[PDB]
Amino acid sequence: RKLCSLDNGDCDQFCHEEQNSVVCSCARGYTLADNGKACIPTGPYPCGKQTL
Amino acid sequence: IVGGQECKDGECPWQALLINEENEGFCGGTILSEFYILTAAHCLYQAKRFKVRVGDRNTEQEEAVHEVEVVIKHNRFTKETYDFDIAVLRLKTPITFRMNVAPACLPERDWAESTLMTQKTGIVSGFGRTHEKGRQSTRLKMLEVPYVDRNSCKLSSSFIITQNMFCAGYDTKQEDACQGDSGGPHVTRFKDTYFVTGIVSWGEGCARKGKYGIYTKVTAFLKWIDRSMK
Numbered sequence: 001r002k003l004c005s006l007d008n009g010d011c012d013q014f015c016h017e018e019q020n021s022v023v024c025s026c027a028r029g030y031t032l033a034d035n036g037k038a039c040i041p042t043g044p045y046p047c048g049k050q051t052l
Numbered sequence: 053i054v055g056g057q058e059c060k061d062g063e064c065p066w067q068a069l070l071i072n073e074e075n076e077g078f079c080g081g082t083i084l085s086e087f088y089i090l091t092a093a094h095c096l097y098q099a100k101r102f103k104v105r106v107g108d109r110n111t112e113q114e115e116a117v118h119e120v121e122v123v124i125k126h127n128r129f130t131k132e133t134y135d136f137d138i139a140v141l142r143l144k145t146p147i148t149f150r151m152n153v154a155p156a157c158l159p160e161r162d163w164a165e166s167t168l169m170t171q172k173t174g175i176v177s178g179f180g181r182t183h184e185k186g187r188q189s190t191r192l193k194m195l196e197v198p199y200v201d202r203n204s205c206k207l208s209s210s211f212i213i214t215q216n217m218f219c220a221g222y223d224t225k226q227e228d229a230c231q232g233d234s235g236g237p238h239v240t241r242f243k244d245t246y247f248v249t250g251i252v253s254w255g256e257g258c259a260r261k262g263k264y265g266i267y268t269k270v271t272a273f274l275k276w277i278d279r280s281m282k
């Protein structure tokens with residue numbers, strides 16, 4: 001396994017392979033982090049998070 | 053839900069409940085954003101007029117009631133086979149997110165198929181029956197359900213499993229969704245984020261041996277859902 005097939009290409013959420021290199025993205029309400037892999041919530045109550 | 057565990061504080065915040073004129077739950081839905089609920093099309097036939105309740109875990113102790121402004125049903129749904137069993141509800145007033153009220157994420161199609169639907173399990177939830185012949189549950193419940201190989205699922209089914217559907221649950225172990233859970237959330241967890249992956253659709257009873265729960269395959273309607281919202 002390579003790129004996206006390897007641990008989601010290290011992405012927090014969406015992993016796509018473009019030009020044979022991982023590109024990560026995030027659902028709406030998240031911003032891709034500086035490292036280009038992690039997803040950061042813009043507000044309170046981002047989608048898909050349990051509210052504990 | 054038959055089997056499974058109770059949803060604890062803030063564990064199933066995207067759960068929506070469809071209530072008839074008598075404040076009785078008949079179907080679930082999934083919160084997609086402040087104005088939009090996802091549910092099953094077949095649910096739209098089980099009541100003349102209805103409202104949407106969110107933030108509720110115990111239907112006895114007080115939660116926020118929302119009214120429906122627009123009901124957007126998939127034109128190709130047929131009561132005959134339950135294909136295209138999907139609808140989106142736009143509300144009159146925006147949902148206020150808070151503890152226990154929050155939206156589930158919508159994934160991208162390719163990633164969802166290769167990464168979400170290939171996980172071992174998903175989670176279905178709702179206020180439906182705890183036994184096939186029982187009454188509606190007053191507590192919100194959740195249940196971890198394994199993805200079922202597509203081949204096995206078809207072989208197990210007395211009816212046709214189209215490409216807009218998938219199977220989840222257990223061959224014999226007695227846990228399944230059930231009456232009242234329809235329209236509700238099937239979500240799949242990835243690194244602590246939950247994505248909508250299914251809509252509780254139908255089953256040959258509840259928890260019956262050699263049968264599975266049948267869900268509307270959300271990945272097949274992603275664009276439709278986006279268009280429904282925009």
Ligand SMILES: C[C@@H](c1ccc(N2CC[C@H](NS(=O)(=O)/C=C/c3ccc(Cl)s3)C2=O)c(F)c1)N(C)C
Pocket residue numbers: 131132133134211228229230231232233234252253254255256257258259264265266267
């Ligand atoms: C699609 C197919 C079909 C087969 C069985 C059903 N049935 C028979 C009874 C059953 N009703 S129910 O208990 O409310 C739903 C139970 C579920 C178990 C697991 C689910 Cl996921 S949904 C149900 O949905 C159906 F509605 C539709 N066709 C005959 C219309």
